[PDB]
Write a protein that binds this ligand. Structure first.
Ligand SMILES: [Zn+2]
Ligand SMILES: [Zn+2]
Ligand SMILES: [Zn+2]
Ligand SMILES: [Zn+2]
Lengths: 681, 99, 83, 184, 93, 119, 97, 107, 539
């Protein structure tokens, strides 16, 4: 047996938009909602037999299976449902487009009403190979009003006129559309208008009530009649308006609703059942479950009873409803609601277009703004002793914030040991996942040990975290390209995020009480993406000015200043200890010749600070430079070099020794091109 | 979910998200707004692109032309949202390797 | 619109800044899957750092492929290329 | 039987990179095909040759190695009518369903050209000619005629075997057929 | 309710320590479900009469300063009381 | 995946069995190494291929073409002669179009003496 | 970039960019989708704020260049082999035709 | 090519573009007072020979379209009287770096 | 779901959904799929096709396209631009699939000329003739008679000789025969605007009507060039009789078939309102005049030129007189005893003409017995709708619809009075009528900005719609039906090849009868429709 299995990795190229057909919907969902609503109150709380909710449409709670594809909330992506609807309710989404497609076609024989090869010209202009979307829309903006200024249709003989979208904004008229007999001017003969007045002669003279008082309504298009009208030109122009028909969609007739697509349950989850029977509804579960009601009304209506007057206002309430189902827009057109109402004037009935739309809604604040996992948030606190490009992390968020590792060949005698610690002590792991891809093994029960004695190669463990794990670090509302950085994490006690003060300026970190965000990456190649590219050291500068944005600030400047102060001196014990403290140990210092000799021995601050730059003789740092710190004082103008001055001066460095001047921001000071921590880099 | 109390998780805003673009990191986003948040396998159908569960396309009963691939669950939720409303993000597909 | 022949190449022979990233990441990931490591591995461990350790030695066996806008492709060997 | 050219995209994990490339390509291909049957052609046997392997293109998400190649692997594709060895395996009243040891059970020869004069009796012959009965696990020469390619993987989720994906058919129109000692 | 896919033990515990809230077995320690998905945040003669009876009912209730609670128990008696049509032709009071 | 040439090279079994046995010698060599799942078919393959030879050579393939290139067998029986039925009597007649027909005596007979040269 | 000076507002941001999701990632998100699908816009996905949606890789930075490993093989081992199944059996079909 | 004085009637543009092989060019009298190409900000533009395009496009391996677009009916366009599918090489002298050039196609 | 009402194939495909089966069912595969693209997207060019079909360029398009042209299922127009080169472009040949869609009825055209030899070999002969003439394309009596046996009597073996003319049968088709009628109007639009002796820009009126009249009057002979041309009909070679020109290829005329079949529907309408004697009289009354009247022929330019709310009257009143005066000379004045079985004195029996009164005929030149048409035929067609909504919704529907006929825009309050029935019925038989359109709706806002309830509603007819979507009948079973023919074939598809080379098993014979009665339904069912189709689409 066993036919070969073949697959190829695919990625999305393009998104072809379209309306679904009238047919493809019912060709999709499993079950007609149809029926009625009721949500079957009996036996179970809302076991939901057929109806808007439905087990074979989807599920909500993790309780009961999904029928079609079951297995609860894990694997069921939802399915659709297709609400059968009586009469062709109009559509608010494509509405303003419907005013185009209908704007541009004669209202009688319904042939595209621009004519001859001119219409062909519009075509030949479109298909020219280099036309972009903007060009398209512009050409449409031409072809449309080009047919407006036509009067009589070409081969119908009938005339036509403007179509005005009756009134605006309320929802009373807002879904009703009107075109009329216009541009009659009354002096020219209109045989049509002659027919028109002769028509009413059999009403007024019969039923004088209506009379001329309420009059001059002309006519409208029943959203029914408008699809009976869309059904005419079923080819020909099409795209002239804007729709490619090789008939995947099959023309401009699906624009208006016929079968209304019921969304899955996983889109409209019933709110938690909570204590006691009523679980809160969830929008779409109430709107369309009412639309079923008003539908089956108009289905049982129009079947036997009702009346042409008491027919429509229902049907109108249908299009007004479903419009309110996919939008807000029309608010309260002197109506108030029906079954399942309230009526304490609940404003935000809008459930759909907006959840997709604005502010922090779906599309932006949710899909592009995705809230994330493997993170942490804490107050800050300075740590000078810690180097740059690290973030001290409290071990108590190191226990619970883990990094995945695939143990292979080099890691064992760490990891087969690293398990036996267990999740409680820090340098250890908690979750474990075997190559057999089962689910995973928490470290909860027991074992370990004899568990770690296996640990095959492709198995995965999750380390707590250690010294060296690359962690990217974020702060506030992030003003510019330096907020996200990445640091080698180092674990310490207490609890708070300790960065090195020098990196406070990119974050404009004030300490005080501000909060951070600690993000570990996950996949092995996102790490090497972080510290290497997005890390501190290489991003030491700024993107815009090519100017050092990390340097000494506050204490570091002034303290450095007080060592740089020409007044100062030191001694081989004091200096020796400084030149030590500058690096906690670890280094081989070659003490240069002392500045003055005789009345003791001393070393000027420019040296004890100079050795900072070139500690060894093997440190391959050789600099030289001139600069001006601020409050520079012009010398006696006779002296051309400014190095000699009333005080301090140029900072001019040669052979990586400081020669003249104090330092004091400026040279080490964050934000002038000429600079020490700049030049070294 | 959101904030303290309920349980963890933090915010990457479009104000912030842009940051990593300037650095130019693709892989950090795909780890970030994709793998680490909602990692999800949708089964789609090359022919007449739409989603579907396990083996069926269900608009065209096939159990043949479906291809398994991954995608942010917010994006799927964006489809089943859309396609509910009448509009159809059909997905034209092509393979990665070999042009 | 095929691979440009070996000798003639139009592009900077220096690495990009980003090249150094994806080379490490991809390489480091291949190290985490049980791949042989070409640089002598000193007593250190973990996948990413031995990759850096390796790129010191230009022992990475990869070829970086640069697509111009038109799709005229391109090749460079990681060894051939200068930091 | 025969040898044919196919192209496929193949994934070598980082493990085997020590092993020489062409062997790994071979190993993965055998892991992919072997017994498995490529449809609307008929089943492979193993990889025979290999050719025009080129620079493999990996994918950002994973980092395993992806090399697409093409080659000729040995398949089973006989000609149409063929007298060939085999024996009835599992049958009741109809033309016998022969197998061949160590290949498959899917050869089914119905009775049309099979000799008309016969009689069936719950024994071991299905049908006994005027020349006689044969027996399972026997050298038996039976002709082949037509083949049925079917795919049939239409699993409707709530249905949770019928595997005649590749099956061959023939009959016995001449002597020595169904029992080899009739000839010889 | 479910069983471990490996240990085949029926004892499940949801660990609340580390802000995972995973469900696990005390037996082999395999997890059942990670990622603990949680939620958050017509025309009838009978609806008219009934909800009207919660109106009239609740009316006489807090007049006597009885528990509002008990009203719901009584009401459903009224529900069952309507089932036998005992409530039809008498004085509503 | 995409298939290029389905009907490509008609392969009978002469050294094909020997070559598959060679690849087998390369990995573990079937049953006895004592003195991947791929093994399953090989012993199978070699099975049905070996029994008729018992119930072989190398140059005999090159020896086989000589007088056999002279016949009307086309490509079909011309491969079939290698294996099925002992190139004798009505056996060889049971296959190819117009098998006896025109060419009879030496054509049906020489197959016997030549198949005796190998089988 | 284009001929006329424009940009940066919700109107001007529709200028060249054909991506319906980024013009729908920004403002007027509804009628970009509707009015989009009405005209049956093709909408290739080349973008960045586009691709982060679908979760595939990016066309800039690290995502600018596919990376490849050398397969390290010479055609010397790639020559086919047969001892002519065909050619010997060929000459039986080369006559009477 | 001729010039307006004051009025432009839409009857003029109604049929302006009569001749297929030849064409028109129309200006306002006031529209030409200072010569725009000669002004200050507008840098020197060069109409490059129709063949020279092919050269250019083959340098950067650019197809057509996908170039910086100059809209038609532009004052610099009209002054130089560009037509469809024509390309101008602009030398922009701006003191940051120095004199450099960039190309634009008329649309 | 359930597939039995078949939704996928069931709605989004009007119009074209017919053709894409016809050319499919009646030709198949690649040959079909082109026309589907053509009709759908309209005008198209050779190379441009393969931009879409994915049809292996300049192979099928060449083969399939010219193949269609031989069957004249496409319209063909080529020219060059002024820039240079040259190019073609294609349309679907008018109806033209009209031919295929009718077929055996166009065979039933025999019944008119069925006289002389009645149900003879002659029947089977001319049957084979015409049924071949449609199957191939244009034919020539020289090359067909050449394919036909020699060495027998040629004017006899092929005895349809002078009968090649009649009304129907054939006309030499060339060039301007099939070109888009619109675009040939646009081409003839040259010579008139394009040719003016550079007089003055003043008064486009002299530039227009003159050019239009010249356009009109030149257009006339353009369609009359094919109408009849003697150099075909007149030829009388030596040792022979008057023949067509055996050389030129001639083709089946569609309109005289149109005309003739229309006559039948009038025979049906009159076959109601008068007596069988008077009926049969009228039945042979057209047989003399059935030649001339245009029916679908005169509107013609009505397609392909913008009307004018003035000049369109000059078109309609032109149609008012067109057949009346000069073609009236061709029409009934004094005619006697065409065949007939009333008996004995036949003259006052002929005076029965006056019995025809409503709503047709019943006029003449003052006292000669004659029937007007150029007024009648137009003022007739507007009646023909009638029934087609009796069994449909039930008879109670008609009278109210029919009521909405005479008076107009009439409120249901006074409908309830004018028609007669309780509310319970009127609500349904109206609402049941409105979903199927026809009646439509008017309304007016009543003390409203725009509101439903407080407003009041009116009705109307607007017959253009009501007639129009009765062409759902087109897509209705002229599509779905014909498919129910197709999907049937695959059941016996394995049998079809057998029954082809047979001329076995009992159950095979059983399903023979099954599929056969099945068929005999599907096509007779069709003819039932098509008879109801001929009205709406044209006239
Ligand atoms: Zn499900
Ligand atoms: Zn019209
Ligand atoms: Zn699909
Ligand atoms: Zn367990």
């Amino acid at each position: 047996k066993e036919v070969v299995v073949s697959e190829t990795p695919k990625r999305i190229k393009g998104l072809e938009f379209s309306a679904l057909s009238a047919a493809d919907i019912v060709a999709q969902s499993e079950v007609e909602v149809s029926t009625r609503d009721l949500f079957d109150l009996e036996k179970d709380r809302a076991p939901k037999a057929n109806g808007a909710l439905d087990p074979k449409m989807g599920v909500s709670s993790s309780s009961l299976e999904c029928a079609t594809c079951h297995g609860n909330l894990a694997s069921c992506h939802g399915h659709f449902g297709h609400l059968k609807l009586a009469l062709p309710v109009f559509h608010i989404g494509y509405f303003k487009a419907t005013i185009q497609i209908l704007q541009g076609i004669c209202k009688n024989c319904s042939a595209i009403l621009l004519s001859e090869t001119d219409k062909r010209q519009f075509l030949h202009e479109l298909r020219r190979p280099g036309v972009d979307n903007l060009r398209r829309m512009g050409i449409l903006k031409k072809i449309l009003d080009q047919c407006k200024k036509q009067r009589r249709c070409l081969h119908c003989g009938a005339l036509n006129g403007v179509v005005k979208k009756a009134a605006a904004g309320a929802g009373s008229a807002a879904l009703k559309i009107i075109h009329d007999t216009f541009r009659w001017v009354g002096k020219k003969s209109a045989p049509e208008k002659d027919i028109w007045v002769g028509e009413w002669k059999e009403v007024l003279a019969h039923n004088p009530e209506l009379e001329r008082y309420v009059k001059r309504c002309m006519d409208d298009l029943n959203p029914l009649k408008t699809l009976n009208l869309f059904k005419q030109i079923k080819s020909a122009d099409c795209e002239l308006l804007g729709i490619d028909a090789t008939v995947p969609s099959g023309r401009p007739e699906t624009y208006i609703w016929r079968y209304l697509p019921a969304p899955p349950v996983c889109i409209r989850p019933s709110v938690m059942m909570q204590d006691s029977p009523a679980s809160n509804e969830d929008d779409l579960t109430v709107k369309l479950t009412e639309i079923v009601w008003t539908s089956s009304l108009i289905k049982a209506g129009l079947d036997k009873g009702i009346s042409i007057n008491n027919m429509m206002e229902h049907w109108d309430y249908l299009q007004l409803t479903v419009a309110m189902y996919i939008n807000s827009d029309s608010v309260n057109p002197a109506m108030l609601p029906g079954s399942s109402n309230g009526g304490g004037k609940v404003k935000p009935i809008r459930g759909f277009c907006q959840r997709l739309k604005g502010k922090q809604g779906r599309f932006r604040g949710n899909l592009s703004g995705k809230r994330v996992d493997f993170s942490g948030r804490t107050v800050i606190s300075p740590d000078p002793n810690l180097s740059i490009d690290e973030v001290a992390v409290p071990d108590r968020v190191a226990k619970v914030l883990t990094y995945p590792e695939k143990v292979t060949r080099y890691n064992r005698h760490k990891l087969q040991e690293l398990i036996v610690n267990g999740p409680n002590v820090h340098p250890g792991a908690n979750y474990l996942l075997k190559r057999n891809e089962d689910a995973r093994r928490n470290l909860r029960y027991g074992d370990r040990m004899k568990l770690a004695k296996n640990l095959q190669i492709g198995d995965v463990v999750e380390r707590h975290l250690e010294d060296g794990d690359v962690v990217l670090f974020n702060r506030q509302p992030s003003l510019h390209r330096l907020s996200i950085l990445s640091h080698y994490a180092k674990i310490r006690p207490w609890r708070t995020f300790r960065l090195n003060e020098c990196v406070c300026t990119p974050y404009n970190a004030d300490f005080d009480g501000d909060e951070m965000n600690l993000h570990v990456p996950q996949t092995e190649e996102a790490r090497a993406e972080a510290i290497n590219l997005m890390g501190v050291k290489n991003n030491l500068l700024t993107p815009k000015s090519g100017e050092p944005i990390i340097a000494a600030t506050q204490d570091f400047i002034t303290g450095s200043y007080l060592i740089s102060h020409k007044d100062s001196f030191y001694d081989r014990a004091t200096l020796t200890q400084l030149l030590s403290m500058m690096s906690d140990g670890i280094e081989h210092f070659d003490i240069p010749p002392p500045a003055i000799m005789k009345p003791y021995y001393l070393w000027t601050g420019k040296q004890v600070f100079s050795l900072l730059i070139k500690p060894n003789h093997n440190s391959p740092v050789v600099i030289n430079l001139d600069a001006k710190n601020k409050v520079f004082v012009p010398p006696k103008s006779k002296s051309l070099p400014n190095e000699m001055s009333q005080n301090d001066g140029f900072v001019i460095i040669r052979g990586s020794q400081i020669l003249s001047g104090v330092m004091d921001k400026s040279v080490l000071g964050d934000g002038k091109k000429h600079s020490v921590f700049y030049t070294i880099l | 979910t959101e904030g303290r109390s309920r349980d963890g998780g933090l915010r990457l805003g479009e104000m912030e998200r842009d940051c990593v673009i300037a650095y130019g990191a693709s892989q950090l986003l795909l780890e970030r707004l994709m793998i680490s948040s909602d990692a999800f396998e949708v089964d789609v159908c090359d022919k007449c692109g739409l989603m579907g569960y396990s083996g069926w396309c269900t608009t065209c009963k096939s159990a043949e032309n479906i291809i398994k691939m991954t995608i942010p669950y917010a994006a799927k939720l964006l489809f089943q949202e859309l396609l509910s409303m009448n509009i159809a993000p059909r997905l034209r597909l092509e393979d990665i390797f070999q042009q | 619109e095929k691979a440009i022949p070996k000798d003639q190449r139009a592009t900077t022979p220096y690495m990009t800044k980003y090249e150094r990233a994806r080379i490490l990441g991809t390489r480091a990931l291949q190290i985490s899957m049980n791949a042989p490591v070409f640089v002598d591995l000193e007593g250190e461990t973990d996948p990413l750092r031995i990759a850096m350790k390796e790129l010191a030695e230009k022992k990475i066996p990869l070829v970086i492929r640069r697509y111009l806008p038109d799709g005229s492709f391109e090749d460079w060997s990681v060894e051939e290329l200068i930091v | 039987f025969i040898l044919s050219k196919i192209a496929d995209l193949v994934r070598i994990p980082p493990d085997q990179f020590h092993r020489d490339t062409i062997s790994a390509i071979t190993h993965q291909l055998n892991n992919k095909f072997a017994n498995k049957i490529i449809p609307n052609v008929g089943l492979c046997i193993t990889i025979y040759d290999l050719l025009t392997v080129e620079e493999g293109q990996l994918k950002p998400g994973d980092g395993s190695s992806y090399i697409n190649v093409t080659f000729r692997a040995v398949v089973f594709k006989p000609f149409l009518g063929e007298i060939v060895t085999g024996w009835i395996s599992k049958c009741t009243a109809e033309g016998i369903k022969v197998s061949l040891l160590g290949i498959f059970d899917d050869i089914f020869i119905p009775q049309n050209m099979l000799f008309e004069g016969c009689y069936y009796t719950p024994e071991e012959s299905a049908w006994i000619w005027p020349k006689l009965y044969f027996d399972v696990n026997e050298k038996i020469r039976f002709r082949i005629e037509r083949e049925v390619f079917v795919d049939v993987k239409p699993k409707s989720p709530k249905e949770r075997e019928k595997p005649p994906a590749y099956a061959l058919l023939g009959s016995c129109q001449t002597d020595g057929m169904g029992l080899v000692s009739w000839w010889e | 309710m479910p069983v471990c896919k490996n240990c085949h033990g029926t004892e499940f515990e949801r660990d609340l320590s580390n802000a995972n809230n995973d469900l696990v077995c005390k037996a082999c320690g395999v997890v059942s479900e990670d990622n603990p998905i949680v939620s958050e945040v017509a025309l009838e003669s009978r609806e008219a009469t009934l909800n009207n009876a919660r109106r009239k009912l609740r009316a006489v209730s807090y007049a006597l300063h009885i528990p509002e609670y008990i009203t719901d128990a009584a009401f459903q008696w009224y529900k069952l009381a309507l089932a036998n049509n005992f409530v039809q032709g008498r004085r509503s009071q | 995946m995409k298939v290029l040439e389905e009907r490509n090279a008609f392969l009978s079994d002469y050294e094909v069995l020997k070559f598959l046995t060679d690849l087998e010698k390369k990995h573990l060599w079937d049953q006895k190494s004592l003195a991947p799942e791929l093994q399953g078919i090989t012993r199978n393959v070699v099975n049905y291929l070996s029994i008729n030879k018992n119930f072989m050579s190398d140059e005999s393939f090159a020896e086989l073409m000589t007088k056999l290139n002279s016949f009307k067998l086309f490509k079909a029986e011309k491969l079939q002669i290698v294996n099925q039925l002992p190139a004798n009597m009505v056996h060889l007649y049971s296959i190819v179009e117009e098998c006896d027909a025109r060419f009879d005596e030496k054509t049906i007979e020489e197959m016997l003496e030549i198949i005796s040269g190998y089988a | 970039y284009k001929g006329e000076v424009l940009g940066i507002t919700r109107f001007g941001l529709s200028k060249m960019r054909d991506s319906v999701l980024q013009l729908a990632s920004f403002e007027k998100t509804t009628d970009h989708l509707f009015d989009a699908a009405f005209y049956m816009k093709k909408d290739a996905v080349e973008g960045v704020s586009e691709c982060i949606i679908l979760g595939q890789t990016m066309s800039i930075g690290t995502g600018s260049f596919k990376v490849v490993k050398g397969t390290n093989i010479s055609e010397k081992d790639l020559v086919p082999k047969r001892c002519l199944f065909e050619s010997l059996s060929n000459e039986a079909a080369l006559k009477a035709n | 090519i001729f010039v307006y004085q004051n009025n432009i009637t839409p009857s003029a543009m109604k049929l302006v573009p009569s001749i297929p092989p030849a064409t028109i060019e129309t200006f306002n009298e006031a529209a030409l007072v200072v010569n725009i190409t000669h002004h200050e900000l507008v840098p020197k533009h060069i109409r490059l020979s129709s063949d020279e395009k092919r050269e250019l496009l083959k340098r950067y391996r650019l197809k057509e379209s996908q170039l910086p677009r100059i809209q038609r009916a532009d004052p610099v366009a009209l002054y130089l009287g560009l037509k469809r599918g024509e390309v101008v090489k602009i030398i922009r002298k701006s003191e940051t770096s120095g004199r450099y050039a960039s190309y634009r196609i008329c649309m | 779901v359930m597939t039995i009402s078949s939704l996928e194939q069931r709605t989004l495909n009007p119009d074209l959904f017919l053709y894409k089966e016809l050319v499919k069912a009646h030709l198949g595969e690649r040959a079909a799929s082109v026309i589907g693209m053509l009709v759908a997207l309209g005008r198209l060019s050779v190379r441009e096709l393969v931009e879409k079909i994915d049809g292996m360029d300049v192979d099928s398009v060449k083969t399939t396209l010219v193949s269609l042209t031989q069957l004249r299922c496409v319209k063909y127009l080529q020219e060059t631009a002024i820039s240079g080169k040259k190019t073609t472009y294609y349309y679907y040949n008018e109806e033209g699939i009209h031919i295929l869609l009718y077929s055996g009825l166009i065979i039933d055209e025999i019944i008119t000329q069925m006289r002389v030899n009645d149900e003879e070999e002659h029947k089977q002969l001319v049957a084979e003739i015409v049924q071949n003439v449609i199957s191939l394309g244009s034919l020539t009596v020289e090359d067909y008679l050449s394919s036909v046996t020699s060495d027998s009597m040629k004017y006899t073996i092929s005895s349809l000789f002078v009968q090649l003319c009649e009304m129907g049968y054939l006309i030499q088709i060339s060039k301007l025969h099939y070109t888009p009628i619109e675009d040939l109007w646009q081409f003839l639009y040259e010579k008139h605007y394009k040719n003016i002796p550079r007089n003055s820009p003043l008064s486009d009126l002299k530039k227009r009507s003159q050019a239009k009249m010249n356009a009109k009057t030149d257009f006339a002979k353009i369609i009359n060039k094919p109408n009849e041309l003697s150099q075909i009909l007149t030829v009388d070679p030596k040792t022979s009789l008057r023949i067509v020109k055996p050389t030129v290829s001639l083709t089946i005329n569609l309109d005289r078939f149109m005309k003739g079949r229309r006559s039948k529907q009038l025979i049906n309408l009159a076959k109601t309102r008068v007596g069988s004697v008077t009926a049969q009289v009228y039945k042979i009354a057209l047989r003399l005049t059935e030649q001339k009247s245009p029916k679908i022929r005169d509107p013609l330019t009505q397609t392909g030129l913008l009307q004018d709310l003035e000049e369109a009257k000059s078109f309609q009143d032109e149609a008012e007189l067109v057949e009346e005066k000069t073609p009236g000379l061709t029409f009934n004045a004094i005619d006697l005893a065409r065949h007939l079985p009333s008996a004995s004195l036949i003259n006052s029996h002929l005076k029965i003409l006056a019995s025809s009164n409503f709503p047709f005929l019943n006029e003449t030149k003052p006292g000669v017995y004659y029937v007007p048409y150029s007024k009648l035929m137009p003022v007739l067609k507007s009646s023909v709708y009638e029934y087609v909504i009796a069994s449909t919704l039930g008879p109670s529907a008609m009278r109210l619809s029919r009521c909405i006929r005479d008076n107009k825009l009439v409120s249901e309050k006074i409908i309830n009075s004018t028609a007669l029935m309780k509310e319970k019925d009127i609500r349904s038989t109206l609402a049941s009528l409105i979903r199927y359109n026809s009646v439509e709706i008017q309304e007016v806002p009543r003390t409203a900005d725009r509101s439903a309830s407080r407003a009041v509603f009116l009705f109307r007819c607007k017959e253009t719609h009501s007639y129009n979507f009765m062409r759902q009948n087109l897509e209705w079973n002229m599509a779905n039906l014909l498919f129910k023919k197709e999907k049937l074939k695959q059941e016996n598809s394995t049998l079809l090849k057998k029954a082809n080379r047979d001329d076995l098993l009992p159950s095979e014979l059983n399903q023979l009868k099954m599929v056969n009665e099945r068929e005999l339904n599907v096509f007779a069912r069709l003819s039932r429709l098509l008879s109801l189709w001929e009205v709406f689409q044209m006239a």
